[PDB]
């Protein structure tokens, strides 16, 4: 009831699919798309006169077959369109009907029925016959009520055999408000306060008269439904939870939607606040009229698009903040008007007219709207039963004319043929309808089976600061945590500066080496083997010993020689116990430290590459024969998909992302000893065309021999899948040279820090790795997700189960040589994102038992 909506201003969402029998559609309005404004006896409308005095169409009237083909491509269950009143009755009164206009709409309705497309027909989408404006004053004159009912009666008689869904008026708020308040819409009066509310009143009474007409004379034998399309914006308090601001949001909504919806869907009178403030000009419903206004709509038809947000004077905002939150608007409707059945009769946004077919932003607007609708259905139990995408094709957009585009199909208005070319949004919406929701195409069923008996089950930690072995208190708590898990392997990182404070071996800190040796030997007593990372750089902790840092760090090739000496010391002091080594963690995501220029990023990375290869060759010559372990490095290896999967430039950007992320280091070390060709060619071209000053330095034949073949296995840190689009960026930094922007996909599960849970990404990655680098042994050395929960971490449990299914699918089905999985990470720190299996107070989270269960079963047998 009135006021209940004010409450709206005060887990895991695993739904992709809309209810069975959800009704998918698309809409146009006659003025926007028909053209032929004076062909075949059509009379002029107030918009024809308004365009000709205040301000090449889609030509649907002559290209009806091209529109029907577009509908077939999309695959809608319904098509919403309006009848042009002056095309049927040139003078509005029901004297002789224009025969060619009747034939046009009749042919359209027949063609829809033959294609199994339900028509939804709007009697009035703003094109009042000019003759009625000039003779009577249009909606200002209440003789319009019988004149409009006469027109509707004819339409029920000629078309209602074939039409089961009727809309009387599209968005009456804008007819009154822009037609007579702002002057932005036909007939273009501005400031006429009395007319604004007199017009609103005759629109409401006309609607009600037509409803009773349909209800008594046509519904018994035609068995359809009739409503009216009410539009509104959404709004949020200008101060976050201020009660006076919330009170004003309610008033903003009441003033736009309540004005027409309280009489029709509510108690049958205008809202109380409006009656008081406007008791002046607001006409009065008699008590008999109130009982005849309410309940005159068989469902709630709701419009939510750019006409209720732009221009800025469209609504009284009461000082508050406009918002595109469709989910909240639907909840307000549910509260205010007592849980009605809802058709989304118009929803969409717009682009500039220069956007032709690649409308990425329309896809992401639709993703957001559709995700909000799905939430409203599933979480809020709002009875949305159908959805009208707007609009079918580009047309005339009112005062904006042809400077914006709203179609799912592109139309070149300067060509004679006006061919309807499907935009990206058309392909996307077509797939929405096919899957009745968001695509499952990349998801496969759970597989049954098991990992090898010698699969490495791991957990990861980052840098352990050094503190009998039981002396060190840090070690006790690590053992208590590992003893609660069934891992066979533990990954942790040393602190180079703790081991070698000066960088020189003559000044080794032997206490630090004793601490790390205790971690390993105590772990072995639990039956857990160590994988030891020598160097784990982060944005907060570069990890270099101070004298190397002040000698220019990784821009000084001497830093690589000092790393070789550090590595040898660790092999000597730990390598009888440690058989798995990572030289460097994610050197390819340490381009955030030497971010000055691209040349800096590429130069530092070159020295990191040399560091790794020097340590690897030292190990291979001097320590492998007596120790028989294995050495590699961990590559940051998120997956990438095109943001817009219907834009060829985004498929190229996805492959380019993998080139700059993974092949950058994997090509030299694994395969050729040199940088990937795609990356060097791309940077060169951007340099050749004057846009970047970056060069990827050429590698001597000697340096290529040093680097090639220096890994014993492939180690990958995989967390998520990024969605990427091509964009020519400015500057000569690393992120500029790769020409990539990122989008978040609202339709997928994600974490408090926006990490997307895309389980099939890891399978695609493992294929890409084997396709480009051969049948190497692969370890996933880090995999995980932050989760806000402190004990019942359901997102981590979901992540673990779904990603491990895809790993096992990579193993059983794709035959990838996957040898280990290390979960990230053992414990979280107090004010960092919560990746830990254990809380910062070493409390166990519920995902431990799930991971133990998978380890015990060796998968999902």
């Amino acid at each position, epitope marked *: 009831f009135s006021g209940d909506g004010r409450a709206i201003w005060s887990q895991l969402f695993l739904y992709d699919t809309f209810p069975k029998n959800f009704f998918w559609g698309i809409g146009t309005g006659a003025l926007q798309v028909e053209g032929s404004w004076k062909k075949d006896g059509k009379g002029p409308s107030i918009w024809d006169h308004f365009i000709h005095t205040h301000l090449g169409s889609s030509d649907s009237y002559i290209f009806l077959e091209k529109d029907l083909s577009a509908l077939d491509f999309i695959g809608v269950s319904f098509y919403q369109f309006s009848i042009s009143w002056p095309r049927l009755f040139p003078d509005g009164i*029901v004297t002789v009907a224009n025969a060619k206009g009747l034939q046009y709409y009749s042919t359209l309705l027949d063609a829809l029925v033959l294609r199994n497309i339900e028509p939804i027909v709007t009697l009035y989408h703003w094109d009042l016959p000019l003759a009625l404006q000039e003779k009577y004053g249009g909606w200002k004159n209440d003789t319009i009520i019988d004149i409009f*009912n006469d027109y509707a*009666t004819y339409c029920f008689q000629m078309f209602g055999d074939r039409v089961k869904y009727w809309i009387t008026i599209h968005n009456p708020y804008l007819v009154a408000w822009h037609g007579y308040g702002t002057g932005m819409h036909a007939p273009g009066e501005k400031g006429n306060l009395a007319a604004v509310y007199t017009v609103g009143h005759n629109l409401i009474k006309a609607h009600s008269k037509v409803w009773h007409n349909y209800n008594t004379h046509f519904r018994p034998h035609q068995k359809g439904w009739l409503s009216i399309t009410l539009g509104s914006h959404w709004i949020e308090p200008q101060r976050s939870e201020n009660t006076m601001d919330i009170f004003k949001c309610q008033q903003s909504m009441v003033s736009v939607l309540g004005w027409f919806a309280n009489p029709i869907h509510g108690d049958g009178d205008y809202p109380e606040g409006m009656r008081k403030k406007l008791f002046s000009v607001l006409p009065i419903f008699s008590e008999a009229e109130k009982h005849e206004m309410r309940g005159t709509a068989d469902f709630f038809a709701f419009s939510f698009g750019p006409n209720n947000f732009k221009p800025l004077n469209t609504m009284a905002k009461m000082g508050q903040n406009v918002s595109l939150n469709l989910r909240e608007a639907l909840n307000w409707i549910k509260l205010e008007y007592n849980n009605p059945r809802i058709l989304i009769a118009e929803n969409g946004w717009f682009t500039d007219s220069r956007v032709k077919t690649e409308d990425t932003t329309a896809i992401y607007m639709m993703k957001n709207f559709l995700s909000q609708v799905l939430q409203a259905i599933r979480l809020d139990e709002i009875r949305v039963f159908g959805y009208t995408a707007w609009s079918l094709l580009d047309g005339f957009e009112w005062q904006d004319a042809y400077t914006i585009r709203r179609g799912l199909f592109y139309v070149d208005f300067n060509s004679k043929q006006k061919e309807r070319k499907p935009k990206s949004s058309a392909h996307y919406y077509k797939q929405i309808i096919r899957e009745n929701g968001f695509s499952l195409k990349e998801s496969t069923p759970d597989v049954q089976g098991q990992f090898p008996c010698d699969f490495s089950w791991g957990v990861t930690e980052s840098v352990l600061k050094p503190e009998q072995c039981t002396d060190f208190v840090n070690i006790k708590k690590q053992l208590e945590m590992l003893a609660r898990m069934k891992v066979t392997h533990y990954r942790f990182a040393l602190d180079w500066a703790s081991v070698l404070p000066t960088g020189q071996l003559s000044a080794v800190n032997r206490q630090a080496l004793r601490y790390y040796r205790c971690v390993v030997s105590e772990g072995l007593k639990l039956g857990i083997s160590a994988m030891v990372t020598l160097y784990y750089p982060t944005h907060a902790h570069l990890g270099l010993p101070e004298p190397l840092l002040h000698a220019d760090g990784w821009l000084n090739p001497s830093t690589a020689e000092a790393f070789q000496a550090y590595a040898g010391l660790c092999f000597q002091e730990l390598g009888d116990l440690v058989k798995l080594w990572i030289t460097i963690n994610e050197p390819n995501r340490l381009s955030d430290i030497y971010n000055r220029s691209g040349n800096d990023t590429y130069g530092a990375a070159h020295n990191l590459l040399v560091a790794h290869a020097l340590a690897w060759r030292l190990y291979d010559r001097q320590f492998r024969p007596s120790q028989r372990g294995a050495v590699s490095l961990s590559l940051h290896a998120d997956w990438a998909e095109p943001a817009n999967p219907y834009a060829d430039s985004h498929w190229r950007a996805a492959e380019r992302f993998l080139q700059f992320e993974i092949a950058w280091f994997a090509e030299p070390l694994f395969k050729t000893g040199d940088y990937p060709a795609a990356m060097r060619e791309y940077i060169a071209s951007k340099h050749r065309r004057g846009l970047s000053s970056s060069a990827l330095p050429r590698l001597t034949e000697a340096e290529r021999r040093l680097l090639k073949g220096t890994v014993d296995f492939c180690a990958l840190n995989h967390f998520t899948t990024r969605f990427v689009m091509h964009e020519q960026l400015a500057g000569s930094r690393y992120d500029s040279d790769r020409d990539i922007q990122f989008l978040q996909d609202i339709t997928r599960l994600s974490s408090p820090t926006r990490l997307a849970v895309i389980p099939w990404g890891v399978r695609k990655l493992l294929r890409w790795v084997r396709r480009n680098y051969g049948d190497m042994d692969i370890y996933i050395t880090a995999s995980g997700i932050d989760d806000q929960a402190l004990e019942d971490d359901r997102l981590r449990k979901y992540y673990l189960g779904k990603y491990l299914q895809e790993v096992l699918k990579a193993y059983l089905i794709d035959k990838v040589r996957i040898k280990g999985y290390y979960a990230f990470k053992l414990a979280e720190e107090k004010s960092k994102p919560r990746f830990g299996f254990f809380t910062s107070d070493f409390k166990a989270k519920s995902s431990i038992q799930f991971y133990n269960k998978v380890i015990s079963s060796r998968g999902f047998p």
Partner: nanobody, 122 residues
């Protein structure tokens, strides 16, 4: 539907009459109410018609300004108020009904007809 006229009769020139047509329908639906008139041996002549909700009314030019057509859907009745009657108005008056809500002026457009009632202006 059956249509039944009444109100005809004999009136002095310059006088006035009110004809009415009551419709009875076994499936009550909307209709256009029409009035035609016929002198003996002459063709049937359009007089006035009215749309279902009364927004459209048409009149023959010989009758504009003198005759007024109206309707009361609750009573299923269409009314013809005839003022300033002339001798040339003497005729049999026929009410007529057309289902499609489109106000037309020729006899073949009307599906249903009353028996007719005599109007005599002496």
């Amino acid at each position: 539907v059956q249509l039944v006229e009444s109100g005809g009769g004999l009136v002095q020139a310059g006088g006035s009459l009110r004809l009415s047509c009551a419709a009875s329908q076994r499936t009550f639906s909307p209709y256009v109410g029409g009035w035609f008139r016929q002198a003996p041996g002459k063709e049937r002549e359009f007089v006035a018609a009215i749309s279902w909700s009364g927004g459209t009314k048409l009149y023959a030019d010989s009758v504009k300004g003198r005759f007024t057509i109206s309707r009361d859907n609750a009573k299923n009745t269409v009314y013809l108020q005839m003022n300033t009657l002339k001798r040339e108005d003497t005729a049999v008056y026929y009410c007529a009904a057309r289902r499609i809500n489109e106000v037309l002026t020729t006899a073949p457009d009307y599906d249903f007809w009353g028996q007719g009632t005599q109007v005599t202006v002496s």
